[PDB]
Each structure stands twice: as structure tokens, then as C-alpha cells.
Amino acid sequence: TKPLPALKLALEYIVPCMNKHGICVVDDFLGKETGQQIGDEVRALHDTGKFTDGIRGDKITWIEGKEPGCETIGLLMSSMDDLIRHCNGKLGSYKINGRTKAMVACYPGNGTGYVRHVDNPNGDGRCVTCIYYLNKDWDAKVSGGILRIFPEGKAQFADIEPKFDRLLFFWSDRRNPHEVQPAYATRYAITVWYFDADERARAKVKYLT
């Protein structure tokens, strides 16, 4: 098929979807070839021992995007950035002016997960969580690993399967407590957090290491 253009995707789906639900899923974000390439790069990082442990049995590594062997991860990151730019400050009241590096995370099966939590509960400036899933042929029925979100104000929770080539946005603050349910296969995800300029400048969190 022909993928929806980035600008149209942002203005006619992501913006309205986020503002209505605070959660937004875009399936088939970059296509099979690019998705599998990202997977090859992440599996290379895992196989070369770049991951280190990060309530949760996750292993993580941070990717700037320019490192040799992470070109396709860099493309993913620039694509996320293009989507955020296209949103043209229509994501709630946020003035988005920065982001973290990419957090590559692995739950190495065997029932590993992440207990229910809020990404940013202390006002540290992160307003949007952006996650890309790269797990080829992942089936929650077999391997679990669902991301369960408990949107505030709603009785029903939202179950997000970590599907291959799947992009997810959600509000990082207390509106969206969430948990990674136990994973029974190797589960890879790439997360970027985007910052609201003013909240971040408030410096509610001071890092000393």
C-alpha cells in the first residue's frame, strides 16, 4: 500500500487521537524492511553486550542515533521528531522543544515485566512518551508482554500489544499509569520522551550522578 504522509498522519490522526484519548497507536509506521533492519540493529546491540539492567526485569541501553551500526535507529528517531514537529504545538498546551535520547529496552522473556507506574509523576518536564515496537510476529496469546494503560477518568484499561512496526504515543504524566505484563519471549522496545520547555526548565528533578 501507500503509507499516509507524515504531515497528514500527524494533523488528522495523532493530534485528534491524543487530545481525545491521551493514547495513540500507529500501526505499520515504517514498513517491514525498515522495521526488520531496526530489529537487526537492536539484536546486534543485545548480542554485543551493550544492554545493562534498568519492580522491573528490564535491560536497557541509550542510543543517540549517530553511533556506527545504529543508522536505522537514527532514522526512526528523526521520524518520531518529524511527527512531533508536524503536530505544530497542537498536543494539548505543551510547548515541545526537546527530547531524551532513545531508550532501547529488552524484557528477556521468563516472565519479566514492569510493575504499574507513572513515567513522569514529579513534574520533570516529560509530556509525551513515544515507543516503537519491533518484535516480529509477536503474539500476546503466546508470549504475553502486553502494555496495560489505566487512563485516568476511564473505567476500562487499554491493552497495547508490542506489535512489530508499531508506534505508540501517550501522555507521560499521571493521566496514564501503566504496566508491562509478564513477557515470555524476548521483547524489544525503543522509547523516546519529549519535553515541554517550561516544565523542564522548572528543574523539579536534580540529577547528581
Binding site: 501507500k2 503509507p3 499516509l4 487521537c17 484519548h21 497507536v25 500507529v26 500501526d27 509506521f29 514498513g31
Partner: peptide, 13 residues
């Protein structure tokens, strides 16, 4: 090309 607005999933292709 169709978004069911009561849901939060759409396929780009």
C-alpha cells in the same frame, strides 16, 4: 484509511 474515533489504533498503510 479509516479511524474509528472511539478507538486509538490506525494502520498507516
Amino acid at each position: 484509511x479509516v479511524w474509528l474515533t472511539d478507538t486509538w489504533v490506525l494502520s498507516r498503510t
